């Protein structure tokens, strides 16, 4: 289970022109672009902070889930939660040959449990000494407008903070950064074997 990203976000999909409206920089100056190189450096640093505390994705970039042994006999819950249209469960071999498999696997969409449950009571078997990478595109939407807005606000509450204080300097809201995140975190109570 490695879970790397195939492609990153384009950067042009991030709302730098709206984050600048948030931070109260300035309206009609002739410069207007001295911060563009750094404002998206803090938006990518605040999304990636909330992508890890919530285990959500938010831009629907493509992922690659390269794993070897199945976690449970048939289920295989995916880590990145809001998914749609798993592309390919290409089953690599011990070395080399990569054979994509329709394989009779389904996809159960959920924000909490994005399973990949199999229908033939057993997922496609795994060549001993070989991995099973799964290409899937997981996230809310393609553009910034398709997000839940409270999670989009939690980026703006957080990336404004990184813009206003640079080093770790200490400085209570009703719905702060944390209270907006908490309905998107994963609530789990299993430490067991299954």
């Amino acid at each position: 289970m490695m879970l790397n990203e195939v492609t990153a976000v384009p950067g042009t999909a991030l709302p730098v022109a709206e984050f600048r409206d948030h931070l109260r920089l300035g309206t009609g100056f002739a410069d207007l672009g001295a911060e563009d190189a750094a404002l998206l450096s803090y938006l990518r640093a605040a999304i990636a902070a909330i992508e890890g505390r919530t285990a959500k994705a938010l831009i629907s970039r493509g992922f690659r889930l390269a794993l070897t042994a199945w976690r449970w006999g048939d289920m295989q819950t995916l880590p990145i939660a809001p998914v749609a249209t798993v592309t390919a469960l290409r089953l690599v071999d011990a070395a080399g040959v990569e054979t994509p498999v329709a394989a009779g696997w389904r996809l159960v969409p959920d924000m909490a449990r994005p399973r990949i449950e199999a229908l033939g009571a057993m997922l496609p078997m795994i060549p001993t000494g070989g991995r099973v990478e799964i290409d899937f595109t997981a996230g809310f939407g393609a553009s910034w407008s398709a997000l839940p807005v409270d999670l989009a606000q939690a980026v703006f509450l957080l990336a404004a903070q990184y813009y206003e204080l640079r080093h770790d300097g200490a400085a209570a809201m009703p719905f702060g950064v944390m209270a907006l995140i908490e309905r998107w975190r994963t609530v789990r109570v299993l430490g067991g074997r299954p």
């Binding site: 006999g73 048939d74 009779g104 389904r106 199999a118 229908l119 033939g120 009571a121 057993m122 997922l123 078997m125 060549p127 001993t128």
Partner: protein, 240 residues
């Protein structure tokens, strides 16, 4: 490996252990019977519906055992990713081609049979069998020689010898007939080559409480099936 004396022999490959899953799907029938029709008639309707359900399930799962897909129903052997024999691997079943695209080969009929029997492999031919439908066995008996006599059960009287090339024949009507690429004849040890998992009961139940003017019987049995041993089934492709 043959171990030399000055070799200091390395460890060899532990054989990979495969674990193939039977999904064990459900198969149910829910006939709706009228209460007045069950109370007035001279026939035992609760028995007759049980007979027709038990006749229907053993044929629906029979077609599932041959041509059903993986999801929602037991998968049959003919649906599985087959390859030409000689190019055989574990993740497939082997076929041999007959020659002509329409039927058996014209210059030598049954020559497509006698090489498949010896292409199956000598250990599984201890208890193997053929599987066909009816009008493939008809075309097999219609194979004649240069004179006009029959290759299989030579006399025109005393048909169905129940013995083709030394092995029995199962007329299973759920195989495809002879076509452009269809696989009419299968052969091999299906006792080791196909596993059937099932709950061995026909539970049948009346409940008038669902549909109140009616009785609405419900019978169900669950059967799952796939191939156990990929090296134990071979097929005839009528293509090349």
């Amino acid at each position: 490996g043959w171990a030399s004396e000055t070799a200091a022999l390395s460890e060899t490959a532990t054989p990979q252990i495969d674990r193939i899953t039977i999904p064990l799907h459900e198969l149910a029938a829910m006939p709706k019977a009228s209460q007045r029709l069950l109370d007035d008639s001279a026939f035992d309707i609760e028995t007759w519906l049980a007979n027709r359900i038990a006749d229907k399930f053993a044929r629906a799962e029979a077609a599932a055992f041959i041509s059903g897909d993986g999801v929602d129903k037991p998968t049959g052997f003919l649906t599985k990713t087959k390859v030409a024999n000689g190019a055989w691997a574990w993740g497939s079943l082997g076929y041999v081609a007959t020659g002509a695209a329409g039927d058996f080969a014209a210059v030598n009929a049954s020559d497509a049979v006698v090489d498949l029997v010896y292409a199956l492999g000598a250990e599984y031919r201890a208890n193997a069998s053929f599987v066909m439908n009816s009008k493939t066995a008809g075309a097999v008996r219609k194979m004649k020689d240069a004179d006009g006599r029959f290759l299989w059960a030579d006399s025109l009287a005393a048909g169905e010898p129940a013995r083709l090339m030394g092995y029995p024949v199962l007329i299973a009507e759920d195989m495809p007939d002879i076509a452009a690429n269809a696989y009419a004849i299968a052969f091999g040890d299906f006792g080791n080559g196909y596993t059937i998992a099932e709950r061995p009961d026909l539970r049948v139940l009346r409940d008038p409480f669902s549909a109140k003017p009616h009785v609405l019987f419900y019978a169900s049995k669950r059967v799952g099936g796939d191939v156990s041993d990929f090296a134990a089934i071979k097929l005839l492709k009528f293509a090349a």
